[PDB]
UniProtKB/Swiss-Prot annotation:
Origin species: Nostoc sp. (strain ATCC 29151 / PCC 7119) (Anabaena sp.)
Top class in the EC scheme: oxidoreductase
Cellular component, GO annotation: phycobilisome; plasma membrane-derived thylakoid membrane
E.C. designation(s): 1.18.1.2
Record key words, sorted: Antenna complex, FAD, Flavoprotein, Membrane, NADP, Oxidoreductase, Phycobilisome, Thylakoid
Coarse class of the protein's main subcellular location: membrane
Binding residue positions for FAD: R69, L70, Y71, S72, C90, V91, R92, Y96, V108, C109, S110, T149
Subcellular location: Cellular thylakoid membrane
Keyword Plastid part of the UniProt annotation: no
Ranges for domain FAD-binding FR-type: 10-134
Protein name stated in the entry: Ferredoxin--NADP reductase
Similarity remark: Belongs to the ferredoxin--NADP reductase type 1 family.
Amino acid sequence: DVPVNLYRPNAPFIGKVISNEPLVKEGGIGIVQHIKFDLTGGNLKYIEGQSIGIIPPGVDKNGKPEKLRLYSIASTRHGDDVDDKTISLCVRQLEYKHPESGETVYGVCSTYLTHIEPGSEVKITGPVGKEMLLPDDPEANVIMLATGTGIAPMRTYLWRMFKDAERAANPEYQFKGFSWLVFGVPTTPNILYKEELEEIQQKYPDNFRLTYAISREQKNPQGGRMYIQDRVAEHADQLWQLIKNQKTHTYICGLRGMEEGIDAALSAAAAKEGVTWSDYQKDLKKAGRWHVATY
Ligand SMILES: Cc1cc2nc3c(=O)[nH]c(=O)nc-3n(C[C@H](O)[C@H](O)[C@H](O)COP(=O)(O)OP(=O)(O)OC[C@H]3O[C@@H](n4cnc5c(N)ncnc54)[C@H](O)[C@@H]3O)c2cc1C
């Protein structure tokens, strides 16, 4: 029933860019774009928490055709306009500099995507992934631990749970559990989808909690910059108490490196009740209730 690999890299779906909109506001670090593609003419279907591949044009430094890069889907199954016609991505332009070249180096696929014009044709593959799926149970609790573009799957969950047009389109999923997003970014300008996330918490104060870790604006209790691992530590008991529920799912997404601190915080919380978190987490993983996609 889960859609997978309706298109493959040997014969991709050629979609058209509808829009390319900035998500980083003035004063922010870097470039993150919300990109919506037209799926009409093909049969690419997908659900929340999945990814698609993008094949950028050109050859690599060895003259080989560029391979696909995976991007978390940022829209629900219905698309941003709830019409079942589009799919959206949340793409950061990769930029770093030296012990890999010259000065500033720009990622191939991400630079291609962030600068792409409406009307352009794009090679799309997928969808892919079954490890970040949202439960059908409307009484599930959902913890979301995201940094940067790791917000993308979280957006698909939250929009499905809480958007007016989504609730109207999805008779059989009227979310009534509790969801908690802890989202780490460097600045307030860098809070991707800020306005809509805060609008959701305002209309559903009992079903959605929003916690920021803003590194350039906040310090942890030890005086370092505030990161997501610091907020999880700050709320470790609360998060552990939620995780003990048989219906609670946790999702972690973003660039690698977050998980070690999250585990240390939850390990100290669980230890207070004689539970070794690493073991409990293994069982959660097996049960399909601990979801991770880092990159
Ligand atoms: C399941 C999954 C989902 C993803 N979802 C998203 C998403 O929603 N949004 C998003 O923006 N990205 C996402 N990514 C990452 C994305 O696929 C691409 O890896 C990323 O966009 C960079 O690709 P590129 O073509 O721009 O870079 P490339 O041109 O391939 O550059 C990357 C290469 O350069 C090197 N490199 C990268 N960073 C550094 C650094 N700091 N220092 C030194 N060398 C470095 C490495 O060799 C790396 O392989 C996801 C990845 C996966 C696996």
